[PDB]
Structure 1
Amino acid sequence: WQARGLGTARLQLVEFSAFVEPPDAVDSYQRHLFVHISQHCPPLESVDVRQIYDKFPEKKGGLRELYDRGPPHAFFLVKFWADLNWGGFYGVSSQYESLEHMTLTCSSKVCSFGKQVVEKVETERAQLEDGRFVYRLLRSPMCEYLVNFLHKLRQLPERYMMNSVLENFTILQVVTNRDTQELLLCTAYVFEVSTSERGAQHHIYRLVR
């Protein structure tokens, strides 16, 4: 009964993206994806969660405890290769599906050297479409820390230097049923930089113990 993409029978990720629209987008629209998961559309490889304890805040909110809460089958790792060739709008959009009408709490902890730099928490509430309930956290604004991190990171003269910094930069993302405090989806993000010719790309793992 193992996961075949990023979700559970109780909450699935439809689509995630982090993006910038340039100011000339009003003239003709364009967006650049830094990172992108689409599951609008085989079992998933696994990673032992102890291997990535150290990259994360290791106290309340942290990947150790949340796994100990369970359920373990809600836990994933996403390796992102971010695409970094591009006063615009810097945005994040998430979209989730469920069969339950729920109210989600959506936390994103940014940890830099495994250490919580910013936490953003939004709650979102269901809408009913084709039987499934749909949760849209669309066009949430990027944390200013990431926007300025991105501008610094892109100017590094060597891609191995970006991957050296990004080896210390992680994001933990926890989706909770607000009414029952009850964990649906935990996603740990680690990052490299992709190349010029390749765009954004990702690989999803199960997290196990």
Structure 2
Amino acid sequence: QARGLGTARLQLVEFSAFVEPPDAVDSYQRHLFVHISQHPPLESVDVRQIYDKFPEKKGGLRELYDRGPPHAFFLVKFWADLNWSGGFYGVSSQYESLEHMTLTCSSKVCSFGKQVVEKVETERAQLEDGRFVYRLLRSPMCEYLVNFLHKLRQLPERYMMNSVLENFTILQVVTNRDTQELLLCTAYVFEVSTSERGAQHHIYRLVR
């Protein structure tokens, strides 16, 4: 059914993680580590295969999928661009719905399948052109991720970065804060891209 990352209840408009150098105040520039812009059917990947790559018990993938709805589950493979010092590291997300809601967005960093960091934010709907928009713009990246990126940047070989990234995942759960029904669940897995190629991504439906 799904052709992009979203459902009929909540569509991802844009997502990106970036850094702006200290000199961005003079001449502006931002480096994008990963970036999705949503301005045929998607491919499918069975969710059982990636269970162990995300935490267990409550808030883990199997219990989340168990809860449903199954069509709300996506996997995004990222080729991150780590080719960009004390600048600003940020994440920005924008979603769109037909109805007015208060969203709770939970993001989980997992390492070898265990939760390491979690950030939980709420966002109330804002009524715009015929539809509601939810704007979580310019969240400071947590210090864990910034230090991770700084070290990962420093590894002498790409396949080493890739081996390290094999064990690092992010799970993003968006729910209706009032009714607790799940709206969107996105599993992110990561590889490093090659210098001249910037960030790229591939989106899959998660089935069972």
- TM normalised by structure 1 equals 0.98
Q: Aligned partners of 2:142 and 2:49: how far apart in 1?
A: 27
Q: Aligned partners of 1:5 and 1:192: how far apart in 2?
A: 21
- Residue 37 of structure 1 aligns to a residue in which SS? strand
Q: Once the 2 structures are TM-superposed, how far is the Cα of residue 58 of structure 1 from its aligned partner? A: 1.5
1:49-89 residue CA offsets vs partner (Å, 9 max, x unmatched) = 00100100012011110000000000000000000001100
- TM normalised by structure 2 equals 0.99
- Residue 67 of structure 1 aligns to a residue in which SS? helix
1:120-167 residue CA offsets vs partner (Å, 9 max, x unmatched) = 000001011111100000000101111000000010000000000000
- Residue 52 of structure 2 aligns to a residue in which SS? coil
* Correspondence for 1:194: 193
* Correspondence for 2:101: 102
Q: Report the number of matched residues.
A: 207
Name the % identity: 100
Q: Aligned partners of 2:144 and 2:111: how far apart in 1?
A: 11
- Residue 165 of structure 1 aligns to a residue in which SS? helix
- Residue 179 of structure 2 aligns to a residue in which SS? coil
Q: Aligned partners of 2:111 and 2:142: how far apart in 1?
A: 14
* Correspondence for 1:51: 49
Q: Aligned partners of 1:137 and 1:36: how far apart in 2?
A: 15
Q: Aligned partners of 1:187 and 1:199: how far apart in 2?
A: 22
1:82-126 residue CA offsets vs partner (Å, 9 max, x unmatched) = 000011000000000000100000000000111100000000010
Q: Aligned partners of 1:143 and 1:202: how far apart in 2?
A: 22
- Residue 152 of structure 2 aligns to a residue in which SS? helix
- Residue 8 of structure 1 aligns to a residue in which SS? coil
**Unpaired runs of at least 5, structure 1:** none
Q: Aligned partners of 2:165 and 2:113: how far apart in 1?
A: 11
Asked if 1:69 corresponds to 2:67, the answer is yes
Q: Aligned partners of 2:206 and 2:87: how far apart in 1?
A: 36
Coordinate RMSD, CA, aligned: 0.4
Q: Aligned partners of 1:193 and 1:56: how far apart in 2?
A: 20
